[PDB]
C-alpha cells in the first residue's frame, strides 16, 4: 500500500541550503521514476523536478526556475529520494511534494507533503494559551474547548486534540498573519459530563522550532 | 509552458446534484504516441492531492463512476453526478504531455440547508497578561452559509479596533463552518472595562445571537 514520507523542511535565509528527504515504502522503489512538486501559495502547484531509473543511468530533469540549483538525487537500497536545495530565494517557499511517477503517464501517488520557507525573519515558537468558559450556563452544545495559538512563525503549526485520539468535532479556523507574526486557535466540543472529570489536552507542533507544545484545559 | 485554465474558480452544489469543471489548455495535449496526458486531481482541505482522472478518461484505483473525464481538443471536462459530502475541496487538471503544469484550481463547496451559528466567549486566560495584551475570543459554531457578522460590544460601546476573524474549511461530514473572532486589548485597556459583549448576525436569524461575561 502506496506510502511516501518527506522530510527536513524548516525556515532559510535568503539565500541557504536544505535538504529534503522522502521516504517511499508499500511498492518496488526501483521500478519507478519519482518526483518533487511544490505548490506555493502564490503559484499554485509547480512541477520541481524528476529522477528516472538506473537502467536510465538515473537521468535528472528540473524545471527550468531551479535549474542549477537544485539537485535530485535517489537510494533505490534506501528507497529514498532526496532534494538538494542550494541558493534559496523567496520564490523557493512552498509546500514540497514527493510523488511517483506512475506506470499510468500520471504522478500517482503523494506525500503529505513537507513545508519551505525562506524569509529573512527567524523562527519564533507559538505560545499556547488555554480557551476555558468562561464560568456561564449550558446553552450551546455540550462544552467548547480550546487552545489559542499566537505569536510563531514561520507556518505551520498542526493542533491535535488527545495526541490526536480525540478527532470529533474539531474546529482549527485558518492561520491568520498579523505584525509580523501568526496565530490561529482549534477547539473541541466535548459532552458536559466528560470534562472534567476526565482529561483534554492539545498537541500544538511547530516543525520550523522543532517543538511539540502539549497543554492540558483544566476547568479553572 | 502550457497553461491550463479552469472554470469556474469556485463552485457550490447541492448534495446528490451534478457538477462540471473544465479546464482549457493554452496548446494541443496530444502526445505523438497519440496519448493525450490530461490529469484530474481532489485536494481535500489540508490533505495531499489525489489521483481521481488519468489521460483525460480513466479512473484510477478506488474511484467511484460518479466521476466522468471527457475532452476535446484543447477543452477538457470532469464530471459528478451523484456529489456528497466527501466530494468537498478543490479540483487540479494536469498535463504531463509537456513539461508538467497544472491549473489553477477549482474549489467545491457543497451548496445546503442553512444553520444556526452557536456562540460561545471565552475570556482572556491569566496565562497571556504578562505577554501585555489580552485577547477575548467569540466562537461561531457550525453555521451555513459562511457569511457572518460578528460585532464586539465593550461596557455597551461597539468596538472595532483590534478585532481578528478567521474561518475553518467546509467540514466534510456536515458541510458547516466554524468561525472566531478575535479581540485583542492591552492588559490594562481590558482591565479598565468589566463587560465584554459579542453579537452575531447570520441570515438564520433576525435578532442578533449574544453572546457576554463580566469580569
Ligand atoms: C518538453 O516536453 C517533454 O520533454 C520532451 C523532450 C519530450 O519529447 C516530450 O514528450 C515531453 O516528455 C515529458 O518530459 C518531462 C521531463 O522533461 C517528463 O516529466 C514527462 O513525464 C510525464 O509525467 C510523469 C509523471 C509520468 O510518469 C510520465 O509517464 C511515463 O512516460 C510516458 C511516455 C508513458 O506513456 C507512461 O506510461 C509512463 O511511462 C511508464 O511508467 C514510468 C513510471 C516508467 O518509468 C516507464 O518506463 C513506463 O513504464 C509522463 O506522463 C514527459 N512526458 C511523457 C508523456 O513522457
Known amino acids: 500500500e502506496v506510502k511516501v514520507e518527506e522530510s527536513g523542511g524548516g525556515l532559510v535565509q535568503p539565500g541557504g541550503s536544505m535538504k529534503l528527504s522522502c521516504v517511499a515504502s508499500?511498492?518496488?522503489?526501483?521500478?519507478?521514476?519519482m518526483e518533487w512538486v511544490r505548490q506555493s501559495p502564490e503559484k499554485g502547484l509547480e512541477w520541481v523536478a524528476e529522477?528516472?531509473?538506473?537502467?536510465?543511468?538515473?537521468?535528472?530533469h528540473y524545471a527550468e526556475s531551479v535549474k542549477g540549483r537544485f539537485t535530485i538525487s535517489r537510494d533505490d537500497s534506501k528507497s529514498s529520494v532526496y532534494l538538494q536545495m542550494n541558493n534559496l530565494r523567496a520564490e523557493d517557499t512552498g509546500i514540497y511534494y514527493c510523488?511517483?511517477?506512475?506506470?499510468?503517464?500520471?504522478?500517482?501517488?503523494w506525500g503529505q507533503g513537507t513545508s519551505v520557507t525562506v524569509s529573512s525573519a527567524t523562527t519564533t515558537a507559538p505560545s499556547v494559551y488555554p480557551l476555558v468558559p468562561g464560568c456561564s450556563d449550558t446553552s450551546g452544545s455540550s462544552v467548547t474547548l480550546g487552545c489559542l495559538v499566537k505569536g510563531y512563525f514561520p507556518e505551520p503549526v498542526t493542533v491535535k486534540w488527545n495526541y490526536g485520539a480525540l478527532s470529533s468535532g474539531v474546529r482549527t479556523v485558518s492561520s491568520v498573519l498579523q505584525s509580523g507574526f501568526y496565530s490561529l486557535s482549534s477547539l473541541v466540543t466535548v459532552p458536559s459530563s466528560t470534562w472534567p472529570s476526565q482529561t483534554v489536552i492539545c498537541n500544538v507542533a511547530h516543525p520550523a522550532s522543532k517543538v511539540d507544545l502539549i497543554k492540558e484545559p483544566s476547568g479553572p | 509552458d502550457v497553461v491550463l485554465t479552469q472554470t469556474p474558480l469556485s463552485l457550490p452544489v447541492r448534495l446528490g446534484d451534478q457538477a462540471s469543471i473544465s479546464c482549457r489548455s493554452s496548446?494541443?495535449?496530444?502526445?505523438?504516441?497519440?496519448?493525450?496526458?490530461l490529469h484530474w486531481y481532489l485536494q481535500k482541505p489540508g490533505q495531499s492531492p489525489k489521483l481521481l482522472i488519468y489521460?483525460?478518461?480513466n479512473r484510477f484505483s478506488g474511484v467511484p463512476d460518479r466521476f466522468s473525464g471527457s475532452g476535446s481538443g484543447t477543452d477538457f471536462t470532469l464530471k459528478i453526478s451523484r456529489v456528497e459530502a466527501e466530494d468537498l475541496g478543490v479540483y487540479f487538471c494536469?498535463?504531463?504531455?509537456?513539461?508538467?503544469?497544472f491549473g489553477g484550481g477549482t474549489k467545491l463547496e457543497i451548496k445546503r440547508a442553512d444553520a444556526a451559528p452557536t456562540v460561545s466567549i471565552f475570556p482572556p486566560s491569566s496565562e497571556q497578561l504578562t505577554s501585555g495584551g489580552a485577547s477575548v475570543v467569540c466562537f461561531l459554531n457550525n453555521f451555513y452559509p459562511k457569511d457572518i457578522n460578528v460585532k464586539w460590544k465593550i461596557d455597551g460601546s461597539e468596538r472595532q479596533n483590534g478585532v481578528l476573524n478567521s474561518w475553518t474549511d467546509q467540514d466534510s461530514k456536515d458541510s458547516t463552518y466554524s468561525m472566531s473572532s478575535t479581540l485583542t486589548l492591552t492588559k490594562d485597556e481590558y482591565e479598565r472595562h468589566n463587560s465584554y459583549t459579542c453579537e452575531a448576525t447570520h441570515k438564520t436569524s433576525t435578532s442578533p445571537i449574544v453572546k457576554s461575561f463580566n469580569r
Open positions: 496548446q494541443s495535449l496530444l502526445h505523438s504516441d497519440g496519448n493525450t496526458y
Open positions: 489521460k483525460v478518461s
Open positions: 494536469s498535463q504531463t504531455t509537456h513539461v508538467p503544469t
Open positions: 508499500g511498492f518496488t522503489f526501483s521500478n519507478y521514476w
Open positions: 529522477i528516472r531509473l538506473k537502467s536510465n543511468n538515473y537521468a535528472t
Open positions: 510523488t511517483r511517477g506512475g506506470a499510468v503517464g500520471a504522478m500517482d501517488y
